[model samples]
Target: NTVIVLYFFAKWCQACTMQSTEMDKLQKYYGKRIYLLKVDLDKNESLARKFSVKSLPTIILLKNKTMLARKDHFVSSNDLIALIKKHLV
Candidate 1:
């Protein structure tokens, strides 16, 4: 089974700037255990809308095409790790 993380953000979003770095770290830490998708809100408007994205930074976890968890503008990689531990592992 594979858990996918869909990170919806905008290039100009302030919250996204720092979160992106943390997400990168999360990817390194999780590696093939999880799939990470960074969707630019501006570039992927329809995709964002389909996901019902309202905020600048939205993070959704999914498995088997079903959503599991959603986080809004996380502060660090810890939150992502905890979520993964709780749901993925």
Candidate 2:
């Protein structure tokens, strides 16, 4: 099954500053298990509006657009792992 993470972020937001880099790190850690989709309030305003994204790094976990659970950022991969594991069942 394909799992997607709609990462709503901005280029200027402090939290989002690590997005590009964090994306790489997460990829290095978890690999293709999660998809990192970028949603900008500037260009992707419609999607952001529809989702009511109000944070710098708002994550909406989905089964290809069908939201399973929304998510926020954390300090470590462990946190992310636990989150995914929780939603696995």
Candidate 3:
């Protein structure tokens, strides 16, 4: 089973900046456990709109290309990992 995680962010958003480092850490720690992808809201306008991402920082977890969980604003890596764990099997 594979989980696809996407971190939606914009270059100028302050909150997104604050969470950027942590998101990177998550990617490093969960490197082998999941597939991580980052999309800049400003650069990837179409994608953001497709996902209905209204917030600056939105974390989406997908299983088999279907959304399993979505978090807006900020979420800890532990919580995100737990969500992934629950949907993995």
The residue pairs in collision within model 2 are none
Best by TM-score: 1
Per-residue CA lDDT of candidate 3, range 47-83, in tens? 9889899887899888775899998888777777677
**lDDT tens per residue, model 2, 43-89:** 89888888887676787677754677775653344565566678777
On residues 10-65, what C-alpha lDDT tens digit does candidate 1 reach at each position? 87898899999988998899899789898988999999889889887899988896
**Candidate 3 segments whose C-alpha is farther than 4 A from its true place:** none
Compared with the true structure, the alpha-carbon lDDT of candidate 3 equals 0.81
Instruction: Determine which window of 10 residues in candidate 2 has minimal summed lDDT.
Output: 72-81
lDDT (Cα atoms) of all candidates against the true structure? 0.85, 0.70, 0.81
Ranking by TM-score: 1, 3, 2
Q: lDDT of candidate 2 vs native?
A: 0.70
Output the better candidate (1/3) by TM-score: 1
Of 2 and 3, which scores higher on lDDT?
A: 3
Segments in model 2 whose C-alpha atoms lie over 4 Å from true places: 64-66, 72-76
